[PDB]
Amino acid sequence: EISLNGYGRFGLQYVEDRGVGLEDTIISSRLRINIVGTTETDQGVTFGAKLRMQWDDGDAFAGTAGNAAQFWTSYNGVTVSVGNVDTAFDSVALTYDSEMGYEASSFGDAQSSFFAYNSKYDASGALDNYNGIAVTYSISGVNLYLSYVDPDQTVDSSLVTEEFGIAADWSNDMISLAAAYTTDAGGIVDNDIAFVGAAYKFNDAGTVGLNWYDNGLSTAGDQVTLYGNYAFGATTVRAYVSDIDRAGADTAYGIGADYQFAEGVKVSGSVQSGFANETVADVGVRFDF
Template sequence: MKKVLFATTALIATAGMAAADVKLSGYGRFGIIYNEGATYGRDGLAGTADDVAADDTSITSRFRLNIDGTTTADNGVTFGARVRMEGDSNAAGFTASPTLRAARFYAMSSGLTVAAGNILGAIDSMPYLYHGSVGLTGLGYVNVVSDYGADDFYSVGAARTGMEVIYEADMYSVHASYSDPVTGAVGSQSRAAIAASANFSGYTIALGYQDSEYGPDVEFVAIVAGEVGPATVSLAYAQDHAGNDQYNLAVSADVAAATEIQAYYNYDEGAVTLTGVALDEDSYGVGFTHDIGGGASLRGGVASLNGTTRADLGVLFNF
């Protein structure tokens, strides 16, 4: 009888394990980076009170680990959650996130996803928003017209608590999100956003709108992208809640079997430092990615960010 009970218990446990799944994924990157007139703060941001001078050329690295857990209920609904651990280093030796960040929880079925917690955000998830990003590190990601003035999945710092609903069909997608403020943080107003995209005849059109009382937050984003000959071309426009316009033209193309180049030009009417000092309105950059197999690639780039030069070179490997 005991053997029967043990066998039954083991069978039930095995069935439960079959329905659940835990996966680890992420990437590592390391290389060298050049920042003209570089300064770093202990908070990881330039332009703040605790800045210290740093060498223009230094070692840069990042290790990112995603932990995903999912299970599928009897009715076919998939429930899941993701947490992230990340460690960054720069010239000041700053480690950004040695502990787990807040989790994103979700339920998904038939193209519909409902999520809560550390959400992805409707604006930050728009297709081609990051198109044209150059180099190993993104070199400031000035090509991203939202300027991170919208909700995204936080890898460092205090995450805003939010909810989002995503519906994806063959050619269309709609994404709505809402988040509560981080208590006491700068720009701590709530955010509500909606974005929609459509794909047809090799082209993508995406529109996004966000309601926020914080001036630097993005209010409207429009993106058009598609294949033009051997290249992928995107044009993005954004306006923040202070009325500043931003435009970005990005191009990527394969130049060999394992090599792609990326380039962008960005015009930002509201370009300022964190302390409010006006910057040059033009930015541009060019970079390359060379696949060396096994999920690893050699990457590098150079960019002029509102009048300041940055460059990097190194290896990124996915796992």
């Protein structure tokens, strides 16, 4: 069986003083299509493969291609994936919950380098022999993630730096905890990164959270992001403040709102301020199909 799903999004993206001769505001858009092939068996083992075709405004050649494949096998809550896998640091819960706006961005997200599912081809040839193995296990409330990525599997191992990551999250109705650790993240020796986050659903409508990161070899240093959101019916308000160790850096912050127009149609906007005082704003829609 083969199924297609995806989303489209478009709106205005503003970055103050974007560049000399450049327009500060542009119409940023993305079309994403996922192609998923699945083979179910009566033994209870499911096999699957997926390909992604994603286009973003500004893409080279004004064209769209597929990325590298991901394959998996699931059985009893355990899933083993091979190829262009999802990594533990990128998969844990809470880590991206400060994001806002129609482009789901946040200066409060981790400021480190690490491997993650690649949505597109890479013209540089860097990903040509990139191959990962991932294992996930959902043990009611608790989720375990494990990933190993070999940036070039054809070359003798001792010559390449592989990334290994572990992550776990747990949640009940009002408290959520998450942690992750990755060594040689992004295939960079000694770029060991860590994450610890907690959230409290202090209501049926609101949640506040705190994420802490060890950004490894990043110039940002350690980071702390405090975020929260509150739902007033169909509209959700979001905000966050983030601080990094980098000497002289500013406190990043953002405020935004989401509006659930209909099932699968979300209108969002935000105004944010970065660590180097960058001012960014956006307003657009995302529709799922």
